[PDB]
Every structure is written in structure tokens, then in C-alpha cells.
Amino acid sequence: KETAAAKFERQHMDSSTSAASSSNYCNQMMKSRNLTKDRCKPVNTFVHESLADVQAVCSQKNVACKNGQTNCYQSYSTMSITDCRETGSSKYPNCAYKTTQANKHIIVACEGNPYVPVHFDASV
């Protein structure tokens, strides 16, 4: 099936745009990446940097993950991100989102050989 690394790219990477494309960005992207198929995923973050720069985070600042595991890493620089958050009106199958752009440090969990991002933990 889909590898964990491929799943991270599908759920979290959008290098095509530099910021939140428009007020409709999250509605379009949550659907097109298949994040509304079985339910409305309540929150998700997209990162607008190159794949190379996000993979490099696995050699940056080691920090504890929210779940207590020790394989999380925080970026030294800020990155361009978009947060998608489920609105009040939203009801499956018609999921609806608010789009918010920010520049923040990202925290990701890394695994494997090669050692690559597999989950998005937080932004700070």
C-alpha cells in the first residue's frame, strides 16, 4: 500500500504555492488529497517549502513528540504553512474549512532508512 513517507507527502506537502492560495484553499485541498473520504478530518497543516528543505528537518533540533516518543525534530528556521480547521457549518459529506496562513517553526516525526518525515506533530 501507500508508504508512510508517501502518506506524509499527500497529507502535508504543497510546494506549488508560496502561501494560502485564497479563502477557498482548504476546501479544495482537503478534498483533493482525500482527507474527507471517510469523515471530515478536523484539523490539518500544509507546508509550502521544497521537499528537500522539509526532509532536512530530520537532522535539526531533536525534541520530545506530543505522544512521548523521542523521534521528533524542530526546524531551525520558520517555514510558510497553511492551517485548515473545520468550521461550525461543516457536516459530512460536505466538509468545510477556514484557511489560515502563518510563518512558524515545524515539528515532525522521522523514521526509516533513509530517515524521512512520517508525521506532522506541531507548529510553534
Query: Per-domain residue ranges for the chain?
Result: 1-124
Binding site for substrate, residues? 7, 10, 41-45, 66, 85
Look at residues 59, 86, 92, 53 and name the one whose alpha carbon lies nearest to residue 73.
Answer: 59
Where b means 16+ CB within 10 Å and e means fewer, 90-99 reads beeeebebeb
CB atoms within 10 A of CB 82: 21
- Topology classification of domain 1-124: P-30 Protein (3.10.130)
Q: Which sequence positions are flagged as catalytic? A: 12, 119
Q: What is the resolution of this structure in A?
A: 1.7
Sorted by sequence, the CB contacts under 8 Å of residue 33 that are 6+ apart come out as 10, 11
Q: How many residues does the chain have?
A: 124
